[PDB]
Design a protein around this ligand. Structure first.
Ligand code: NAP
Ligand code: NAP
Ligand code: NAP
Ligand code: NAP
Ligand code: HSE
Ligand code: HSE
Ligand code: HSE
Ligand code: HSE
Ligand code: NA
Ligand code: NA
Ligand code: NA
Ligand code: NA
Lengths: 331, 331, 331, 331
């Protein structure tokens, strides 16, 4: 039996859900050979109301080199990056739910991803299987991928069909915990773009640049637009697409008119839909955002690590596109 | 004496400071024959402890059309937009501290700015005079403008100079209520870009696009780079620059090497430095972020409105630059 | 018109109610000649959830000598005492809701009370008139005083008559905000004893020692006892008594069997009952605990000060008792 | 392997630390063939953020009679008493950290202590061995005991020595989770008196009354008095003393002038110093307050219980002292 010493960065909705999940499942962990011991949890206010014991909180950075694992769910890019890099350099794995970090600091983080040090299931659709889904889909070659990767904007659109306004639905969305710190990342497509980028690097091109994703959010959408779509037998959704065009992978986020019976249209939560050769059509759906949902993903990754498996490896080499996609109707 | 009917959007660091500042200055407001009456205060979470009366909190949007003023300090772009437009269309002024909104929704908001309906001193360098400073600088023709517009990154570079880390500094500035909710906006220069855009529009080109600002942040800087600059007799700062190049106005945000005696290098606070013809060289500096500092700007604008002055007008035409310029050397 | 600069010690349920009340009533204050300006609010956690703007919070002591008034509602004895004494020494008045402080540090605080520097209506039965009540009763000579001075133990007994247990009622009492930090002060009679002491010093003996109060709390009481009392046509209540015996003032707190039609028994909140010569029988009742209720008392004292009146003066000399009381049935 | 059924009373600084410590040590507990199962956790406010599952929180008292252990860390005396007695009467052990309860409700609790049903290591000097230390010291006859039992006042006097104020120090210790909820209990010596009582009862007289302890606090001490002691080669500390005087045991808490090389003066932490016949002079020191420190004591007691050992027994008789003693000189 061994101690698994964990440094947690962030003690918010996710961090705190992860902390309590780990301790609540310590019996499971013992069957994996370990007892979980948190070194410290990095936060900003160490004395406010929080669902972690106060003495574990650290309002300043602390040395991570004695940890066996670093778990990050602090948000942002350059601050977690600088905090994680010395741990990575020492061969200490990272488990993160932070898609911005991986999408926008990939020049620094790719080499550690490639040696299997980075686990990040929770960074796309929370603890819904997305990355593991794609890992199994690698048995085939992608033809087209379409996801509804952002839960905030899904919630908002669901509410506006029901005739609620953007602002009341976003407000409602932010109470329920779905949005990023700044909901602009959600409603402009950027958070979907970060997720889509990570999917692209896993499946089709390990160098895929976040800057190459074309992203348009839901700012032109209203209840009227959505309800008129319903009347044509369609649903409008924000969709993240990956497809070949002129021999290269293209990545877009935009609102799309979907047939109402399409798997993407009938999903109540977040969803990833592929067509691949020779498998065919496959689809995964589940909760894409929330504390418990994300902590599930991070805990799934801890068990993966404990099992002796590497983190989520980028594609070993870029894959040649088989077909010209370019499906589509925008809005 | 008559009610001044205010709808306030946001009850946070800024909104709350503003609410309480208004209350305690009620004596001052009576000298205009008004008494301040809040129609409601839009907030996300009506349960958090707040220095605003529970009975005035609204967790859903409320009718604005009876207000004499809408004050906005909620953050984001699309949601505040959709909330203020009806008031603006009714000829109700807006007082805002939200630079993202004005930079990114200008196609919708410019017509109302041109009519004098938008007050936004607090949208740049908080209640430090920036917009009013530029309004006076209009007596001359701009040669060049350079500002340290972002308080969060000034704070960070000041603390890194003294040997503190990036991560520590950042944690503090967030604590002090300086950082945008997405602090990436601060540290990648985007928030300074938004501010720069507004200054360009006030001075030189009323349709200057936010997309035309070139922005880069502080992500490559460390305590070491800064300390080496100090030994060369310099300071590295993030600088927002507006200058002529090949007959057009260029807007850039980037780290710059400044001579250490330069006003920008020494300033107490955020700072704006302008050479213009025939005035010469003028400078303003003060706090550029903080609840109190921002509530001062908003309240300044409310007093401006009560005086019968219009809001901040865009430049009444676009005009080319007088002189070819450049910023300081990059890093 | 003048600035009234206020230093607040404590930003809890009371402190925060007082802060918001002051600002909410600044129009009233202007009719008294002043505009209220808080120098700072002393707390412990300056970044947690609180109904006061964060920049006013001070997590460390600050200089009080520039204030026009010090307002204290921090709890305890020696820490507020040391904080207030330099202000008192400088002739700066104190307004307090802190009965422990005044009861247990009277050797230090009496001399300042005697020069009218201490206002403390809110320290007995919150903003229910108690001290001002006694000030008017000084027109007569006390024969007997009996109060139900502690709201926690009143609540608890009210709930146990209804058949609820001590522990559920105390729990219920502490949620509703009635109890001291440690409810032992309430349930053992000590908080009533502190209040009774202050009443004694106002009315009958300016040197009355807190140590001379005999106090017994409600620890032997159960629903059964209380319900049996109801059946004999009585109510049991914790009562604070002041009466002459052998030519001296005696002070006791204890549970008592009251006739059910007695003013003390039929009071739903806290209550002070006197017999005095030549007035006769007089009685005041109201809320004895709670934020809003206490802030009312502190604000009543601020207006008193602004009116040019002194604070609550002790009796100028001990008064000779006229009759042997010693009413009573204990339980 | 069998459930160890625990009812926990209190979910605060101590309770929460305890809850999470139990969870993470579940592996260790399996070595006794148990798995820990919480039947519920009594709390005041089920809405505060807490590192305990919502579904286990109870805001009203719950049946305890199915528990194998009641752990108490709620504070107060009468309410915990009325809650544990039924469990105690059923032959269910109590593990407590509450020294006030044991000192002040001993007429009710002594019979169950005498039966081995009360574990209270954490009630004195937290998880620093104090009770177990004394249990071993029973191999000798006590000559004299002197301890620095109160962590809050040690902390305060340590910080005042270094020039900090009373008020600052106090604010900190409260922040660190050291202080009783009424910190007056700490600074007037009452909390050390409660602890002293329990040590007297374990060692010399199983009915030693709390009322017989003479207690005075640190209220006359300042940075100046302490600094002057240091210049005389001394340290002033609050000391809890048990010593023989005229054939009876005397118990006193007071500030004392200690030689600076004395173990009590130097100790790292709270400290207990005992001369006994024939052992000689023994000493123990460690942290005497804190969530983690206390949860360690409680967990030590739970392991003691699982080992088949009884709780902490009172002295099996009263006996007079062997030698006339005295404490150090007062201040
Ligand atoms: N919630 C979701 O549904 C969800 C789903 C999937 C992925 N994620 C990802 O999880 C991350 C965090 O989200 P969350 O919902 O847990 O955020 P949250 O509730 O705000 O918590 C973020 C935590 O990080 C701390 N923190 C933030 N910036 C910091 C800095 N510069 N220095 C030190 N501490 C810092 C905060 O401290 P304080 O608490 O003191 O302020 C807090 O403890 C993000 O990357 C997000 O994209 C979230
Ligand atoms: N802080 C500064 O230094 C500073 C300086 C100048 C300008 N500004 C600008 O001031 C604006 C507000 O900043 P801040 O510091 O006050 O942020 P803050 O502390 O987060 O306050 C945001 C307020 O708006 C509410 N809110 C956020 N999104 C909402 C939505 N979709 N619907 C309804 N209510 C919403 C929040 O409700 P809850 O409290 O219920 O969460 C909160 O009351 C930003 O535009 C910022 O760029 C800030
Ligand atoms: N509530 C009532 O019904 C009531 C009625 C009449 C009289 N009172 C009296 O009012 C006083 C306070 O009561 P409350 O209900 O407002 O208490 P509360 O909600 O706990 O607030 C007490 C405040 O004082 C601060 N504080 C406490 N000790 C401190 C120290 N040593 N150093 C610095 N700051 C300290 C706290 O800081 P934090 O908030 O950071 O912890 C908090 O801001 C007591 O004397 C009480 O007897 C209360
Ligand atoms: N802190 C230490 O260093 C230390 C060391 C040794 C012993 N102790 C002892 O441990 C005990 C608890 O101290 P602590 O630091 O954990 O205090 P704390 O942080 O205030 O926790 C008290 C807990 O009990 C709950 N509570 C209080 N009174 C209650 C009532 N009448 N009914 C139901 N629930 C009640 C509170 O509920 P909420 O959270 O809902 O408010 C809280 O969960 C005290 O007896 C103290 O003397 C403390
Ligand atoms: N804010 C993000 C979290 C994970 O994608 C969302 O709404 O989906
Ligand atoms: N985050 C912004 C707010 C004020 O514009 C700043 O740091 O300057
Ligand atoms: N806890 C106190 C406040 C004022 O007496 C009470 O219950 O009455
Ligand atoms: N307030 C107590 C808790 C531990 O007994 C102390 O300071 O020692
Ligand atoms: Na996932
Ligand atoms: Na400004
Ligand atoms: Na009163
Ligand atoms: Na102990």
């Amino acid at each position: 039996m061994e101690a698994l010493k964990i440094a947690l960065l962030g003690g918010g909705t996710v961090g705190s859900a992860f902390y309590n999940l780990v301790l609540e499942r310590a019996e499971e962990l013992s069957a994996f050979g370990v007892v979980p011991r948190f070194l410290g949890v990095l936060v900003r206010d160490p004395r406010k109301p929080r669902a972690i014991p106060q003495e574990l909180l650290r309002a300043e950075p602390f040395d991570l080199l004695e940890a066996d694992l670093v778990v990050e769910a602090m948000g942002g890019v350059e601050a977690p990056l600088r905090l994680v890099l010395p741990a990575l350099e020492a061969g200490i794995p990272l488990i993160t739910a932070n898609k911005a970090l991986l999408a926008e600091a990939w020049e620094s983080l790719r080499p550690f991803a490639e040696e299997g040090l980075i686990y990040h299931e929770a960074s796309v659709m929370a603890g819904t299987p997305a990355l593991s889904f794609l890992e199994t889909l690698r048995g085939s070659e992608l033809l087209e991928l379409h996801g509804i990767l952002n839960g905030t904007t899904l919630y908002i659109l669901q509410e506006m069909e029901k005739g609620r306004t953007y602002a009341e639905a976003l407000l409602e969305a932010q109470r329920l915990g779905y949005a990023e710190a700044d909901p602009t990342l959600d409603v402009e497509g950027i958070d979907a773009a970060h997720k889509l980028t990570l999917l692209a690097r896993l499946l089709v091109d390990p160098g895929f640049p976040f800057a190459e994703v074309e992203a348009q959010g839901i700012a032109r959408l209203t209840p009227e637009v959505l309800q008129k779509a319903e009347a044509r037998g369609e649903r409008v959704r924000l969709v993240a697409s990956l497809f070949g065009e002129g021999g290269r992978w293209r990545a877009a986020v935009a609102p799309r008119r979907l047939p109402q019976d399409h798997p993407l249209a009938r999903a109540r939560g977040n969803a990833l839909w592929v067509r691949a050769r020779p498998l065919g059509e496959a689809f995964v759906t589940g909760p894409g955002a929330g504390g418990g949902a994300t902590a599930s993903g991070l805990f799934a990754d801890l068990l993966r690590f404990l099992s002796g498996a590497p983190g989520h490896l980028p594609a070993p080499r870029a894959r040649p596109p088989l077909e010209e996609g370019s499906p589509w109707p925008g809005v």
